[PDB]
PDB file of N, CA, C and O in Angstrom:
ATOM      1  N   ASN Z 178     -11.244  -5.918  13.136  1.00 18.94           N
ATOM      2  CA  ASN Z 178     -12.179  -5.309  14.118  1.00 18.94           C
ATOM      3  C   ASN Z 178     -11.642  -3.938  14.596  1.00 18.94           C
ATOM      4  O   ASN Z 178     -10.429  -3.690  14.534  1.00 18.94           O
ATOM      5  N   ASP Z 179     -12.569  -3.062  15.048  1.00 18.32           N
ATOM      6  CA  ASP Z 179     -12.252  -1.706  15.573  1.00 18.32           C
ATOM      7  C   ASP Z 179     -13.505  -1.076  16.222  1.00 18.32           C
ATOM      8  O   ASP Z 179     -14.615  -1.597  16.083  1.00 18.32           O
ATOM      9  N   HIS Z 180     -13.302   0.062  16.912  1.00 18.56           N
ATOM     10  CA  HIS Z 180     -14.389   0.850  17.532  1.00 18.56           C
ATOM     11  C   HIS Z 180     -14.124   2.351  17.289  1.00 18.56           C
ATOM     12  O   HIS Z 180     -13.259   2.943  17.943  1.00 18.56           O
ATOM     13  N   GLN Z 181     -14.847   2.947  16.329  1.00 16.85           N
ATOM     14  CA  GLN Z 181     -14.756   4.395  16.049  1.00 16.85           C
ATOM     15  C   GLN Z 181     -15.686   5.162  16.998  1.00 16.85           C
ATOM     16  O   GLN Z 181     -16.916   5.032  16.925  1.00 16.85           O
ATOM     17  N   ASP Z 182     -15.067   5.916  17.910  1.00 14.17           N
ATOM     18  CA  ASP Z 182     -15.769   6.703  18.940  1.00 14.17           C
ATOM     19  C   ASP Z 182     -16.465   7.937  18.347  1.00 14.17           C
ATOM     20  O   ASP Z 182     -16.054   8.471  17.300  1.00 14.17           O
ATOM     21  N   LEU Z 183     -17.511   8.388  19.063  1.00 10.84           N
ATOM     22  CA  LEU Z 183     -18.391   9.478  18.625  1.00 10.84           C
ATOM     23  C   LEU Z 183     -17.724  10.839  18.855  1.00 10.84           C
ATOM     24  O   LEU Z 183     -17.014  11.045  19.845  1.00 10.84           O
ATOM     25  N   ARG Z 184     -17.985  11.747  17.914  1.00 13.50           N
ATOM     26  CA  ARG Z 184     -17.427  13.107  17.910  1.00 13.50           C
ATOM     27  C   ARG Z 184     -18.572  14.135  18.042  1.00 13.50           C
ATOM     28  O   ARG Z 184     -19.496  14.149  17.221  1.00 13.50           O
ATOM     29  N   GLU Z 185     -18.516  14.948  19.113  1.00 17.26           N
ATOM     30  CA  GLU Z 185     -19.411  16.110  19.328  1.00 17.26           C
ATOM     31  C   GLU Z 185     -18.581  17.312  19.849  1.00 17.26           C
ATOM     32  O   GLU Z 185     -17.341  17.278  19.811  1.00 17.26           O
ATOM     33  N   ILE Z 186     -19.257  18.379  20.319  1.00 14.16           N
ATOM     34  CA  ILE Z 186     -18.580  19.635  20.699  1.00 14.16           C
ATOM     35  C   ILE Z 186     -17.896  19.491  22.085  1.00 14.16           C
ATOM     36  O   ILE Z 186     -18.557  19.554  23.131  1.00 14.16           O
ATOM     37  N   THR Z 187     -16.567  19.282  22.066  1.00 14.82           N
ATOM     38  CA  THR Z 187     -15.722  19.187  23.268  1.00 14.82           C
ATOM     39  C   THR Z 187     -14.331  19.782  22.954  1.00 14.82           C
ATOM     40  O   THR Z 187     -13.570  19.216  22.155  1.00 14.82           O
ATOM     41  N   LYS Z 188     -14.025  20.936  23.576  1.00 15.29           N
ATOM     42  CA  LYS Z 188     -12.732  21.646  23.408  1.00 15.29           C
ATOM     43  C   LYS Z 188     -11.793  21.379  24.610  1.00 15.29           C
ATOM     44  O   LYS Z 188     -10.831  22.124  24.835  1.00 15.29           O
ATOM     45  N   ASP Z 189     -12.097  20.312  25.383  1.00 12.22           N
ATOM     46  CA  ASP Z 189     -11.260  19.857  26.510  1.00 12.22           C
ATOM     47  C   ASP Z 189      -9.910  19.364  25.980  1.00 12.22           C
ATOM     48  O   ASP Z 189      -9.883  18.492  25.107  1.00 12.22           O
ATOM     49  N   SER Z 190      -8.812  19.902  26.542  1.00 13.53           N
ATOM     50  CA  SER Z 190      -7.450  19.695  26.026  1.00 13.53           C
ATOM     51  C   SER Z 190      -7.074  18.195  25.959  1.00 13.53           C
ATOM     52  O   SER Z 190      -6.462  17.772  24.983  1.00 13.53           O
ATOM     53  N   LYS Z 191      -7.473  17.405  26.988  1.00 13.15           N
ATOM     54  CA  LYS Z 191      -7.172  15.949  27.061  1.00 13.15           C
ATOM     55  C   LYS Z 191      -7.871  15.215  25.895  1.00 13.15           C
ATOM     56  O   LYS Z 191      -7.250  14.393  25.211  1.00 13.15           O
ATOM     57  N   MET Z 192      -9.165  15.538  25.681  1.00 12.21           N
ATOM     58  CA  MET Z 192      -9.987  14.963  24.588  1.00 12.21           C
ATOM     59  C   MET Z 192      -9.406  15.328  23.210  1.00 12.21           C
ATOM     60  O   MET Z 192      -9.441  14.519  22.268  1.00 12.21           O
ATOM     61  N   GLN Z 193      -8.850  16.547  23.116  1.00 11.82           N
ATOM     62  CA  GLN Z 193      -8.175  17.024  21.901  1.00 11.82           C
ATOM     63  C   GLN Z 193      -6.863  16.252  21.681  1.00 11.82           C
ATOM     64  O   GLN Z 193      -6.490  15.997  20.546  1.00 11.82           O
ATOM     65  N   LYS Z 194      -6.177  15.884  22.780  1.00 13.07           N
ATOM     66  CA  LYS Z 194      -4.930  15.087  22.727  1.00 13.07           C
ATOM     67  C   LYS Z 194      -5.217  13.636  22.314  1.00 13.07           C
ATOM     68  O   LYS Z 194      -4.360  12.992  21.713  1.00 13.07           O
ATOM     69  N   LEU Z 195      -6.420  13.127  22.662  1.00 10.55           N
ATOM     70  CA  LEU Z 195      -6.889  11.800  22.199  1.00 10.55           C
ATOM     71  C   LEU Z 195      -7.108  11.840  20.675  1.00 10.55           C
ATOM     72  O   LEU Z 195      -6.697  10.926  19.943  1.00 10.55           O
ATOM     73  N   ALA Z 196      -7.770  12.923  20.231  1.00 14.28           N
ATOM     74  CA  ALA Z 196      -8.033  13.205  18.809  1.00 14.28           C
ATOM     75  C   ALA Z 196      -6.713  13.313  18.011  1.00 14.28           C
ATOM     76  O   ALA Z 196      -6.561  12.703  16.941  1.00 14.28           O
ATOM     77  N   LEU Z 197      -5.756  14.068  18.585  1.00 13.12           N
ATOM     78  CA  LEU Z 197      -4.424  14.287  17.996  1.00 13.12           C
ATOM     79  C   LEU Z 197      -3.615  12.986  17.970  1.00 13.12           C
ATOM     80  O   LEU Z 197      -2.888  12.754  17.017  1.00 13.12           O
ATOM     81  N   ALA Z 198      -3.750  12.154  19.022  1.00 11.46           N
ATOM     82  CA  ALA Z 198      -3.010  10.879  19.137  1.00 11.46           C
ATOM     83  C   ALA Z 198      -3.410   9.929  18.003  1.00 11.46           C
ATOM     84  O   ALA Z 198      -2.560   9.507  17.214  1.00 11.46           O
ATOM     85  N   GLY Z 199      -4.725   9.675  17.891  1.00 14.64           N
ATOM     86  CA  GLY Z 199      -5.264   8.786  16.858  1.00 14.64           C
ATOM     87  C   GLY Z 199      -4.972   9.294  15.452  1.00 14.64           C
ATOM     88  O   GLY Z 199      -4.719   8.494  14.537  1.00 14.64           O
ATOM     89  N   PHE Z 200      -4.985  10.638  15.297  1.00 10.13           N
ATOM     90  CA  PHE Z 200      -4.539  11.318  14.070  1.00 10.13           C
ATOM     91  C   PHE Z 200      -3.073  10.957  13.766  1.00 10.13           C
ATOM     92  O   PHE Z 200      -2.784  10.438  12.692  1.00 10.13           O
ATOM     93  N   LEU Z 201      -2.182  11.176  14.753  1.00  9.70           N
ATOM     94  CA  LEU Z 201      -0.718  11.033  14.589  1.00  9.70           C
ATOM     95  C   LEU Z 201      -0.315   9.607  14.181  1.00  9.70           C
ATOM     96  O   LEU Z 201       0.637   9.427  13.414  1.00  9.70           O
ATOM     97  N   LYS Z 202      -1.037   8.605  14.707  1.00  7.90           N
ATOM     98  CA  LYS Z 202      -0.822   7.196  14.332  1.00  7.90           C
ATOM     99  C   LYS Z 202      -1.323   6.927  12.900  1.00  7.90           C
ATOM    100  O   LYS Z 202      -0.536   6.471  12.041  1.00  7.90           O
ATOM    101  N   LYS Z 203      -2.621   7.256  12.634  1.00  6.56           N
ATOM    102  CA  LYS Z 203      -3.289   6.908  11.356  1.00  6.56           C
ATOM    103  C   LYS Z 203      -2.543   7.502  10.150  1.00  6.56           C
ATOM    104  O   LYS Z 203      -2.607   6.914   9.068  1.00  6.56           O
ATOM    105  N   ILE Z 204      -1.798   8.639  10.377  1.00  6.00           N
ATOM    106  CA  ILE Z 204      -0.966   9.318   9.342  1.00  6.00           C
ATOM    107  C   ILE Z 204      -0.174   8.296   8.507  1.00  6.00           C
ATOM    108  O   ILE Z 204      -0.228   8.313   7.275  1.00  6.00           O
ATOM    109  N   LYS Z 205       0.486   7.355   9.214  1.00  5.29           N
ATOM    110  CA  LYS Z 205       1.458   6.427   8.606  1.00  5.29           C
ATOM    111  C   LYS Z 205       0.808   5.484   7.558  1.00  5.29           C
ATOM    112  O   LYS Z 205       1.496   5.001   6.648  1.00  5.29           O
ATOM    113  N   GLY Z 206      -0.518   5.254   7.683  1.00  9.16           N
ATOM    114  CA  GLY Z 206      -1.262   4.377   6.764  1.00  9.16           C
ATOM    115  C   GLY Z 206      -2.490   5.041   6.150  1.00  9.16           C
ATOM    116  O   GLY Z 206      -3.425   4.342   5.733  1.00  9.16           O
ATOM    117  N   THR Z 207      -2.504   6.388   6.084  1.00 10.84           N
ATOM    118  CA  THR Z 207      -3.601   7.147   5.421  1.00 10.84           C
ATOM    119  C   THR Z 207      -3.013   8.194   4.455  1.00 10.84           C
ATOM    120  O   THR Z 207      -1.827   8.539   4.540  1.00 10.84           O
ATOM    121  N   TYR Z 208      -3.884   8.717   3.567  1.00  7.68           N
ATOM    122  CA  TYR Z 208      -3.527   9.706   2.526  1.00  7.68           C
ATOM    123  C   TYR Z 208      -3.004  11.021   3.144  1.00  7.68           C
ATOM    124  O   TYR Z 208      -2.276  11.766   2.486  1.00  7.68           O
ATOM    125  N   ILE Z 209      -3.436  11.320   4.397  1.00  9.25           N
ATOM    126  CA  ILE Z 209      -3.050  12.552   5.126  1.00  9.25           C
ATOM    127  C   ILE Z 209      -1.508  12.717   5.206  1.00  9.25           C
ATOM    128  O   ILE Z 209      -1.023  13.844   5.150  1.00  9.25           O
ATOM    129  N   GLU Z 210      -0.751  11.583   5.285  1.00  7.86           N
ATOM    130  CA  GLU Z 210       0.739  11.599   5.242  1.00  7.86           C
ATOM    131  C   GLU Z 210       1.231  12.388   4.015  1.00  7.86           C
ATOM    132  O   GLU Z 210       2.061  13.296   4.149  1.00  7.86           O
ATOM    133  N   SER Z 211       0.679  12.032   2.832  1.00  9.16           N
ATOM    134  CA  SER Z 211       0.988  12.703   1.557  1.00  9.16           C
ATOM    135  C   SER Z 211       0.743  14.213   1.664  1.00  9.16           C
ATOM    136  O   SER Z 211       1.618  15.003   1.326  1.00  9.16           O
ATOM    137  N   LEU Z 212      -0.435  14.591   2.202  1.00  8.19           N
ATOM    138  CA  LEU Z 212      -0.844  16.010   2.323  1.00  8.19           C
ATOM    139  C   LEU Z 212       0.167  16.806   3.177  1.00  8.19           C
ATOM    140  O   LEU Z 212       0.575  17.902   2.807  1.00  8.19           O
ATOM    141  N   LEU Z 213       0.563  16.214   4.312  1.00  5.40           N
ATOM    142  CA  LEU Z 213       1.459  16.850   5.294  1.00  5.40           C
ATOM    143  C   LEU Z 213       2.890  17.027   4.721  1.00  5.40           C
ATOM    144  O   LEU Z 213       3.562  18.020   4.999  1.00  5.40           O
ATOM    145  N   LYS Z 214       3.335  16.018   3.954  1.00  8.33           N
ATOM    146  CA  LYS Z 214       4.653  16.008   3.278  1.00  8.33           C
ATOM    147  C   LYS Z 214       4.728  17.066   2.147  1.00  8.33           C
ATOM    148  O   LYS Z 214       5.674  17.862   2.093  1.00  8.33           O
ATOM    149  N   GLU Z 215       3.708  17.066   1.266  1.00  5.78           N
ATOM    150  CA  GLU Z 215       3.639  17.939   0.069  1.00  5.78           C
ATOM    151  C   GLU Z 215       3.455  19.417   0.471  1.00  5.78           C
ATOM    152  O   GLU Z 215       4.150  20.307  -0.029  1.00  5.78           O
ATOM    153  N   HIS Z 216       2.515  19.648   1.403  1.00  4.46           N
ATOM    154  CA  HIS Z 216       2.157  20.999   1.897  1.00  4.46           C
ATOM    155  C   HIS Z 216       3.147  21.495   2.971  1.00  4.46           C
ATOM    156  O   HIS Z 216       3.067  22.655   3.381  1.00  4.46           O
ATOM    157  N   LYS Z 217       4.063  20.591   3.414  1.00  5.37           N
ATOM    158  CA  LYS Z 217       5.134  20.885   4.400  1.00  5.37           C
ATOM    159  C   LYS Z 217       4.546  21.277   5.771  1.00  5.37           C
ATOM    160  O   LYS Z 217       5.077  22.142   6.485  1.00  5.37           O
ATOM    161  N   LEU Z 218       3.440  20.607   6.122  1.00  5.15           N
ATOM    162  CA  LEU Z 218       2.746  20.776   7.410  1.00  5.15           C
ATOM    163  C   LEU Z 218       3.507  20.043   8.535  1.00  5.15           C
ATOM    164  O   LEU Z 218       3.424  20.436   9.700  1.00  5.15           O
ATOM    165  N   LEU Z 219       4.211  18.951   8.173  1.00  4.33           N
ATOM    166  CA  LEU Z 219       5.187  18.288   9.064  1.00  4.33           C
ATOM    167  C   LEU Z 219       6.585  18.927   8.838  1.00  4.33           C
ATOM    168  O   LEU Z 219       6.911  19.913   9.528  1.00  4.33           O
TER     169      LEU Z 219
END
């Protein structure tokens, strides 16, 4: 089970930190980890 929240136009720093948080976790079990390692983004 899960709940994927809706995305619209919001440049509020806290909302961006929520976006960044969920990003930072999902990295460990998504293809994006590979991209960040290979492209040296991390």
